[model samples]
Target: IEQNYAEQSEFTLKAIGRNINYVLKEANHFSESSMLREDIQQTLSINHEVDQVVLAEYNRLLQRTFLFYTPSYSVHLYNFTGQLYNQGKIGYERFTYESLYKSPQVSEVIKLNGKPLWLGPYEFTESSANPNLFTSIRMINNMGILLQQFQFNNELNEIFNYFGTTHSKAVRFMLVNQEGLIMMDNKGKLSGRKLSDYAGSPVVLGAEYQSRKMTFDQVESVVSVHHLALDDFGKMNWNVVSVTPWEYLS
Candidate 1:
């Protein structure tokens, strides 16, 4: 049962990644125009998985699918809602190539050389209204980088809700990155915490799927880890971990 939940989690994440990749690929053809705004608006409305889409070009132009634009810097953001605001004016701070490339996540995407990379459960900015964003970035012909940001909270909650309905509530599921940080969990209490905090060294090294008996939260439990097999289109080293108390295994 734990292994089954892990597989389902992986499938859900991969499906979202693939969809983001497709959106970025299609956005490459978008130019600044009324049609562009319409396209972006339609994309956002149709794609429930993505919360925001941003395109930052080498020409210093930035465009966002939503109205989170603000002006505090030299650049301006063209919001798809028919409003134009100077970059850094209202919400999350804007970024430049210099500042953006300095990030390890952005650098990784650059290293991929046009391949899309998934990163985060981090805040867009300290003051931004939205928190816990997972961003996918891809470079476009050396011209710019496109970003698709979404929150994992709703998606994971829905998945876990289904699991709880179909299976025993004693079974806990968590999505953890390679660093052991909990991205999402069946219970809301675990996000932003480390898996190791509850289970000492819960990571399964050097294997795609591994199951072992371990002590979790002072209870004997079975831990199953499923490494997400993200391909060239979407690259992320994440795992789906499930913990079932020994008593619940029957």
Candidate 2:
């Protein structure tokens, strides 16, 4: 049951990755519109047939399999020297609703370049109840990025709790990033630690079964690691790790 469930979880994560990859690819195209005109908003208007198709594509991405809430797209245009040219403007919303860009994540997204980044499982606003998490990629045609905000859902808690509730008390499921930080886990005991905090170096995908004392609980157990090339896009280096007692697995 544990092994099969693990496999299913892997499949689900890959599917999510694929969806993210698809949206970012479309965003790459949309970002290049800066090359068509000196003022990027002119190209973003639905007044043109091309702009209409862009909206359709953006809407298509908003409906993703894994995203928890209605996703939003924000593109901050830039000039050749990597300076912000569009002040407080999101191409999509500026053209559609014709409003100011009010995303809390855009400021952070704009600072990035080249690759897409997975940032924060933080809060939506100071008074807001939900969490804010998003993935964004920088545009190639200009110094800008296409950002997508992911809504936090109960499903994430369900996923995290699965191993804790169903599996043996000795079993643990965790996700660690390239920075060696623990990003996800069922038990709060291991939620915010580093990989090296364990007795050994982090395990690689398909590595030999090994054992180590976990950092938080100090519970010794056998560890199995799966490297997520996240969506197979090679954009991030993170790992899904499972720890089970030798007696439990036996």
Candidate 3:
């Protein structure tokens, strides 16, 4: 049962990764066209999966849909009734391509030279009210970067409910990166925390799928690990770990 749940979790995560890859591809195509604002507006109006889209040029950034942020010297694309309007700068200076370029993750995406890189569970905007977002960044013809921020909360919640992992005491379903950082979990409190902190080492070295008995949070549990194949999208080696307390199976 634990193994089945792990496989199902992997499938869910892969579906999300593939969809984000497709959306980024769509965003990249829009950026290359002459009608940038028109293309983005159309996409935003039609695509419910993507909540926000951002295009970062060397000197300026352009945003459309959902987020209220306004970068310095950048433009916000909006549609009032049937007409499109470029809302001039309103907010103070915040994030920029220059500042993002310094990040190791962003640097890696730049090196990919047009390939989209998936990152986060981190807040992408300066606003505190916004939830953590999964950001996909792609470099475009050395002209700029294209980013799409989205969430898979609904899908994750469904998966947890399907596996009957509603409480932390019975079981815990976590999506963790290769380094052991928890990206998403059945219980929301563990995001951004390290899996290694709770389980000595959540990852099994060199194993793609493994199920074994391990000590998790001082309780002996059955741990199932499923390493995701996300190489086609980016270099994120993530895993779907399903931990079931020994008592739950008895």
Candidate 4:
């Protein structure tokens, strides 16, 4: 079930990704939700499978969804990069023998091998300007993206599994399922429904366009699966939302 939806070329995923980003950029001075009902309605219709790609997106979105307006909630952005560089005759032995004791590949991999671009869901920060959200400006050298999220250490392990090499490749987004807990069935089957919906539950598409972007903004950049961190016992669980954007990041 949780195959490789990341390789699929569908207009649905692409369109949603663009629209979700649209909602985010416009949310600066707008009422987000009530103003973009039409767009929100359209996004809700998308039904893409949440494979490894989408599931990762899901974790990214969960952070924002949980922090939106909660009194104690806040978001933070961490912009770090894991780059790849090849200048001269790079040799593994030369690195350790001459310079930093590493090749461009190993150096690069270390930077990204499990590096997280987002992390959050904390109620407060240590400073005044900590708007509960932050971003990485030069996360991946070849990639030009602006994501809305926080601490992603927990959810990013999956990205590393897919990205493999550390070089210019990077991972972004937050993993904060404060309510319930987003699960993976351990067998790695439950993906963007890419695996299985062991629990028959639905996701809560934001109330309005602006509100939707609050979660989908960064999500549109990739496939998303907001797996609840807990069981569906009550409102204490986050929904297993399926954000099937029909596009890939540029």
Candidate 5:
């Protein structure tokens, strides 16, 4: 998504700049595009001329707000867990070992009393049998240490489950992290299992990776991989790989 956004931003920014001009105009106010058309056209014929300085300042504010004020879900999880460490509300043991994924979110972490105290992970709840899990890491002394996750759960199954059950080749989707540890999968594969363990032709889709045919689950498969952005800073360590049986083309 981030990569596509960056690639298309030229047109995007142009559209935004142009749209800002007609924002208050009837083209937008009374147009038939129902979603944005319903606000009931305002009667004001206000100035559409925003100064370059104001636009520049607004752009800066927007960027900064995105960078700091709005953290990605994973990043926010880490921040809250770290807060727990700082307040002595929960010990390092609780944050480090606990694995609560479904419906468990940090209500609010104990704010670090001093210098953004030591970092950690998220909330707690009773363990379920088939746990849906993800990891969260916090900043340590504000140095920015994220969670080092070794396991995961199936909470994300609903969104990507279709990929797994596709009738053509029975495409399976696997979500993996930097080290290629499977985070989630719709095929009921083990979560912590390394990607290399399952693929006959070990593929690593990183800064520079490959695309090819491989044997997975004893089936000849063609794999296409894409990385996922977990934060606003454009980090793409985690990824989802789709594997389709090669015989489907035959």
Candidate 6:
């Protein structure tokens, strides 16, 4: 989602000499967390405009609060697990891992505090005992600042007249099951939430990464709809080349 933001930003806003220099500096490190802080500092120092602050904060949040998830572990040249989930889940794993795929996700590993995660609602081939089986990979990262966007503001106001202004809600944390559209929030004093009842139904969650292009924001919003927020930052990046599962997975 943010992949084109930098390149496109140049065209949208005419960066001042100072901002231009900052952008150049931003290119050095692609990590959003680092880039966003730098931009926030630039905005504070150079641009005093409220609009600029908003935009800066937006970008900063993208860096700090936003995260990316993909199907592949990207550890090796060829990510096989991701390919299996995408293509093979259709039939290949039916005999071996199908039972594992349908088991309950109540495992503690499923709740990585409140970090964002990537998962899927994979449908298997008819060859499987349960064709409705949902198989998927998961990616989790904590950067909970955009839960507001995930909330249905218009609906909130209308549905809950007592629903007061929202902002301090900032974001205690974000949660994504990835296995399904289940979304949870751990923002502030409020506990986690269910996206279907809170945001809307039929929402989608983050899927595994792919070589093909993907919009992180688009994926996150879908994931957010299922979860409100959660506790801490927890994650695991699965490498396909390394067939050995993580201690946690084991």
Instruction: State candidate 3's TM-score.
Output: 0.59
Q: lDDT tens digits, residues 103-207, model 4? A: 232233234433322222232122223323322211222231122223232233443333321221332222223332332221223322211232223323221
Q: Can you write out model 5's per-residue Cα lDDT over 1-250, one digit (the tens) per residue?
A: 3233223322332332233223213222221221121221110111244456854554343233222321211222122232211101111123342342222322111232111111111112232222333333323332222232212223244334432333442667666666676756667765557788888886765522335678986889866565543322222255566676777645
Report how far off residue 149 is in candidate 1 (Å).
Answer: 1.5
lDDT of 3: 0.53
TM-score of 1: 0.58
Question: Against the true structure, what is each candidate's TM-score?
Answer: 0.58, 0.46, 0.59, 0.20, 0.41, 0.18
Q: Give the Å shift of residue 238 in candidate 5.
A: 0.6
The order by descending TM-score is 3, 1, 2, 5, 4, 6
Which one wins by TM-score: 1 or 2?
Answer: 1
Model 6 stretches astray by more than 4 angstroms: 1-172, 178-184, 189-192, 208-250
Candidate maximizing lDDT: 3
True-structure lDDT of candidate 4: 0.28
Q: Candidate 2: where are CA atoms >4 Å away?
A: 1-68, 71-134, 140-143, 149-155, 160-166, 200-202, 205-216, 231-235, 245-250
Q: What are the Cα lDDT values of the candidates?
A: 0.51, 0.44, 0.53, 0.28, 0.38, 0.25
Stretches of candidate 5 off by over 4 Å are: 1-131, 136-155, 162-169, 207-210, 231-236
Across residues 111-214, which tens digit of lDDT does each residue of candidate 1 receive? 87766565645422321343455555555434444554443455555555554434467777776777787766666677778888898545683246677778
Q: Model 3, which residues run further than 4 Å from truth?
A: 1-93, 122-131, 163-169, 200-202, 232-234
Q: What residue pairs are clashing in model 5? A: 133-153, 137-147
Each prediction's RMSD to truth: 9.7, 9.6, 9.7, 23.1, 17.4, 23.9
- Writing each residue's lDDT as its tens digit, candidate 2 over 126-160 gives 21222333334343333334443443234445554
